[PDB]
Write an enzyme that holds these catalytic residues in place. Structure first.
Site, PDB file in Angstrom:
ATOM      1  N   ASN A 143       0.755  -1.367  -0.019  1.00 43.64           N
ATOM      2  CA  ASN A 143      -0.502   0.196   0.213  1.00 43.64           C
ATOM      3  C   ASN A 143       0.864   1.218  -0.065  1.00 43.64           C
ATOM      4  OD1 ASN A 143       0.080   1.276   3.844  1.00 43.64           O
ATOM      5  ND2 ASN A 143       1.120  -0.836   2.672  1.00 43.64           N
ATOM      6  N   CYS A 196       1.563   3.263   2.143  1.00 44.64           N
ATOM      7  CA  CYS A 196       2.812   3.766   3.908  1.00 44.64           C
ATOM      8  C   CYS A 196       3.595   2.457   3.312  1.00 44.64           C
ATOM      9  CB  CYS A 196       2.231   4.312   4.223  1.00 44.64           C
ATOM     10  SG  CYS A 196       1.952   5.691   4.155  1.00 44.64           S
ATOM     11  N   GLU A 228       3.322  -0.743   4.973  1.00 44.10           N
ATOM     12  CA  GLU A 228       3.067  -1.673   6.148  1.00 44.10           C
ATOM     13  C   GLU A 228       2.442  -2.864   6.014  1.00 44.10           C
ATOM     14  OE1 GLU A 228       1.458   1.479   5.750  1.00 44.10           O
ATOM     15  OE2 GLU A 228      -0.408   1.483   7.110  1.00 44.10           O
TER      16      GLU A 228
END
Ligand SMILES: Nc1ncnc2c1ncn2[C@H]1C[C@H](O)[C@@H](COP(=O)(O)OP(=O)(O)OP(=O)(O)O)O1
Ligand SMILES: Nc1ncnc2c1ncn2[C@H]1C[C@H](O)[C@@H](COP(=O)(O)OP(=O)(O)OP(=O)(O)O)O1
Ligand SMILES: [Mg+2]
Ligand SMILES: [Mg+2]
Lengths: 619, 611
Positions: free
Chosen positions: B311, B313, B315
């Site tokens: 995604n 970010c 994570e």
């Protein structure tokens, strides 16, 4: 004279070094290794004729007994007509005919052809076997429909199409949306995604229309004003031309509103028009699309509706319909101060069958395009070589004589093209939607204005006959034809020559070589030519060269010798006998004003023209 | 101490003026006229707890006239936990829970609730009822799949999502195309269509992750791409083993760039490729590194399914059409006399897993394919915030082995109970559809993370074995950036150290306010704001200096090793920024990458101060 004698006249006349460069360059087929499968126009004619003849496999009027005999007759005529360069289909037919077929079959001597060979042709046409220039695609007012449209643009571009849409369904910039936290971006903004797609889907041009009464029309008019670099843009008039002209004359105001927004505005129509004129005066965009006028003559209106044109504006298409185009070089039909109507009629009949047969061998990218096109079978038969034809006849382009000749020539072509569609509707079955169309549900429907030809009565007669039998919803167009007129060595479309002489350097191991219009060479002392020839390529015109006879100067006019109204009125003369639209650039001098542009638009509103493109020299 | 007593410690502690600005601003629901339906964090907690409780409607283990009682119990606990700010789901849950529902039902006193009220809630969830932050979307090598993906980006962005793709299937720029008379444009040029699409679909804009594999012919163009693609974060994908890349690098070896549907190849020195990445990250922060191979090594469904992208970010490594389903515990609220209250924390873990798993059930996804990918795996992303502040309270320096040992045991304890809770729920409710084809089943001794830094290890292998029989969720843990929800919770973000102790985003750190003597604060406050750290301030005790470290007091390896400590007990990935001083060089960055390759981290983000 008979088409066959005209064919011998022409069949062995070889393409010029010019044409041959273009052919080698873009048209001669190559194997997967980059080697040429074709090295001569003759190869292209054989390959294309063979493929288009194959649609005769589906003729319900041929007993399986005859199919091979009769198919091979059609490949022969198609072959001879194409090699003589008397008629040329448009570029995609020439690029993509026979893609997917075994190479041993496309160029086989015609006398070695079995029915099995033909059926094999028909069956091995792959997804690149796309043979139309352009399409229209709708763009509804939802994120789903917008991006589904972008996908369809990319998919059509992949296989070599151009595409147009009307973006007016898209709700104005700033407008409420039930299904998001966002405000709608509006048409101009979303069009950038359309332009992005095409910047990355390459080939080796789009039409974007917004309606005059859309809340964002001012933003649109100024859209391409430093992007939307792959767009041509036109302003759409879905209302009657009469009504726009009247509002204008009264200095009235237009309400800009959208069904699914609360944003509205009132603007003066004169100010809106000036804003269009100013931008066109500067850059040549946006054009005008009189959609109302197109729908006035649309056999299927209002069951179906014409919302957009293709990138060049010469076909108004309903959703998912395709440009199916080809052109006759009328310059080759000059015979002792006359147009050989006998040979021209035969060619019309053959050309209409040819183009109608392209539909049957055409592979379209979307199922909805196949459907739209099978249902209406809209053809685009047109002409090229008309500027050169006029030189031959010693008729000045900018004259009523030329316009009267034009309308009669067009009306003659219309008549026979439409008679042929009767013939074919009889022999092969009518276009699926004939029953719901105005040729059926109406008395006296003609799909164009007429009113400038002695053929009018015979045309209404044929239009009545076609209540019973009609292969095609519409048959005629006048396309720009740049490439195929270069292949045919003739003037483009109905357009005057842009130049009579221009220098084209053939690169070697660079070294300039001079072109002079061939009909001029044939009709001017090479004596006079040799001196003036130098000043001609310098000044671009014959107008002000001292020692050249009066009536060579009058006849050998180019685009810019011909004033804007004389451009516009030639457009109207052809539009009167064309059931689709016309590609016509209204050229204007550098010294033309915004007012002069406005005056062209006003006159456009009173003539029978269905659109306007202006190009001001030097802009 | 019991979670209920911890709740009472916290339930009436009111959000700060800070938090309340942010809530009014973005989170308090408004009527169609722009007026507030919510004016207090309490309203949000009621609305969200009620909606997430509603998924209890689908419990196969609740009979009749046991259903309403047990739903109301869940709404009550969810409610109290949320209001105490002990656990908060991520933003979309907070924004979009209850969209489509009659307003008279969302904030009704819980004692007035009928089963009919709940069923009505469950049924009036409209298309904006989208409660996930981000998705992964595949982009196949055809014009059809590219632009079909573009449509999906637009459709997801419309409902609030961010989206990631790996663009390595797209054949290299200049390549042969059968279906066309042109050459393939390449993945870097096709990304522009995606950015363009997002530039135009507005939200109030979408974050995107664009990944291209290290061995794609266009990687050098890609590494230099954003040097537009302004809406992309870009990372370099490593689908092969980290071991193998580290080895090739040590040997000064060469990487073949090739693509299955192109003849375009090249050989590059892996050292030069890495230097080109480091130089760009040294300058601009992008591109990060995605250790796709390492995420797949621990993916229960590999190779039946494959993780190709993160995604935006980074994570959560997600397989195609899966969704981020995130929420975080404020661990700073679990400090109790020099210790972490594991008794209360264990209760909250069990509740927080159930909550996130129930979000799936009340989530309205934009594409059918997302619904399917999510229903089938039920991946959760339970994480933490408040960790930096928790360390301040415990007087542990962030940049110390003490802190990292603390972090691993804390994380292992959380993983244990979270995975136990997924057993419990797989029993009560049914297993995630693909349990049978997953490595928890088809394997002996499969653990979905490295471990190796905690006394909890054996108990975790034990629970992993149990979950051969019963398992509600393919994975359960993540450490998310958490910027907004930690602001709401008045706590540090994620596992990140505080960036600053005093500022304006205001905003003096609350734990420091409590330790550091009043007046000794005011005589230094000015200079803390100026110099950004406590480090070079005359006469703050050496011990306040050691504990109250900020991001840039902590050197790059100490950042990286914290990431490794947590990653060993998280089954998804970690959001960790490796902060570097302005004076860091391109060789220092390369050294971070090399160490990353040796540790258990699944990705890297570096940010050099002042770049
Ligand atoms: N997030 C957005 N940003 C910009 N424009 C948007 C956004 N979402 C939708 N639009 C535009 C695209 C179309 O012009 C128009 C319709 O959007 P659409 O996808 O139909 O929303 P909707 O149908 O859920 O809401 P409505 O009921 O108002 O039509 O609004
Ligand atoms: N005309 C084009 N311009 C730029 N890129 C293109 C073009 N056509 C296709 N591509 C890209 C998109 C994909 O990365 C790749 C595949 O194209 P695609 O649509 O699959 O052609 P195809 O599927 O008919 O050919 P093939 O049979 O080789 O896959 O090439
Ligand atoms: Mg809609
Ligand atoms: Mg393909």
């Amino acid at each position: 004279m008979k088409l066959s004698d005209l064919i011998s006249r022409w069949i062995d006349v070889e393409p010029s070094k010019n044409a041959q460069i273009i052919l080698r360059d873009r048209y001669f087929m190559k194997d997967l290794d980059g080697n040429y499968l074709e090295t001569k126009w003759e190869d292209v004619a054989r390959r294309v004729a063979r493929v288009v003849a194959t649609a005769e496999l589906l003729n319900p009027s041929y007993k399986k007994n005859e199919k091979l005999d009769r198919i091979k007759e059609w490949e022969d005529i198609f072959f001879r007509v194409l090699k003589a360069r008397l008629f040329i289909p448009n570029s995609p037919t020439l690029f993509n005919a026979g893609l997917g077929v075994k190479h041993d079959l496309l160029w086989k001597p015609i006398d070695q052809m079995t029915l099995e060979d033909y059926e094999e042709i028909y069956r091995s046409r792959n997804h690149l076997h796309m043979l139309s220039a352009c399409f229209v695609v709708p763009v509804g007012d939802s994120i789903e429909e917008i991006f589904e449209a972008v996908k369809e643009y990319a998919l059509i571009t992949k296989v070599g199409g151009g595409v147009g849409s009307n973006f007016s369904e898209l709700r104005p910039k700033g407008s409420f949306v039930a299904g998001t936290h966002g405000k709608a971006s509006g048409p101009v903004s979303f069009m950038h995604v359309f332009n992005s797609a095409i910047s990355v889907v390459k080939q080796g041009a789009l039409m974007g229309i917004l309606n005059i009464n859309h809340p964002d029309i001012e933003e649109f008019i100024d859209a391409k004003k430093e992007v939307l670099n792959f767009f041509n843009l036109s302003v759409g008039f879905p209302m009657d031309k009469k009504e726009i002209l009247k509002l204008y004359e009264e200095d009235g105001e237009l309400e800009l509103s959208h069904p699914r927004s609360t944003i509205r505005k009132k603007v003066k129509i004169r100010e809106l028009f000036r804003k269009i004129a100013t931008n066109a005066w500067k850059s040549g965009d946006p054009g005008l699309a009189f959609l109302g006028e197109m729908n006035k003559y649309y056999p299927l209106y209002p069951h179906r509706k014409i919302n957009s044109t293709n990138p060049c504006g010469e076909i108004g298409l309903s959703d998912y319909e395709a440009c199916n185009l080809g052109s006759i070089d009328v310059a080759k039909f000059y015979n002792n101060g006359f147009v050989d109507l006998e040979a021209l009629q035969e060619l019309v009949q053959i050309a209409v069958r040819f183009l109608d047969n392209v539909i049957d061998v055409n592979v379209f990218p979307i199922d909805k395009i196949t459907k739209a096109v099978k249902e209406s079978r809209r053809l685009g038969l047109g002409i090229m070589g008309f500027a050169d034809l006029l030189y031959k006849l010693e008729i000045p382009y900018n004259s009523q004589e030329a316009r009267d000749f034009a309308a009669n020539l067009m009306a003659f072509i219309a008549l026979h093209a439409h008679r042929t569609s009767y013939e074919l509707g009889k022999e092969k079955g009518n276009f699926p939607l004939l029953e719901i169309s105005r040729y059926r549900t109406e008395d006296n429907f003609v799909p164009f204005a007429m009113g400038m030809s002695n053929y009018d009565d015979e045309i209404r007669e044929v239009m009545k006959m076609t209540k019973e039998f009609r292969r095609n919803v519409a048959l005629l167009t006048i396309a720009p034809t740049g490439s195929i007129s270069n292949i045919a060595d003739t003037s483009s479309g109905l357009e005057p020559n842009f130049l009579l002489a221009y220098t084209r350097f053939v690169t070697k191991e660079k070294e300039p070589l001079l072109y002079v219009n061939q009909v001029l060479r044939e009709k001017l002392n090479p004596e006079i030519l040799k001196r003036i020839e130098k000043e001609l390529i310098e000044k671009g015109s014959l107008k002000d060269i001292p020692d050249v006879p009066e009536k060579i100067k009058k006849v050998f006019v180019v685009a810019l010798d011909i004033d804007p109204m004389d451009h516009l009125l030639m457009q109207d003369a052809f539009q009167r006998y064309v059931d689709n639209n016309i590609s016509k650039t209204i050229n204007m001098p550098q010294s033309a004003t915004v007012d002069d542009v406005l005056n062209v638009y006003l006159e456009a509103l009173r003539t029978n023209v269905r659109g306007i493109t202006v190009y001001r020299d030097g802009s």
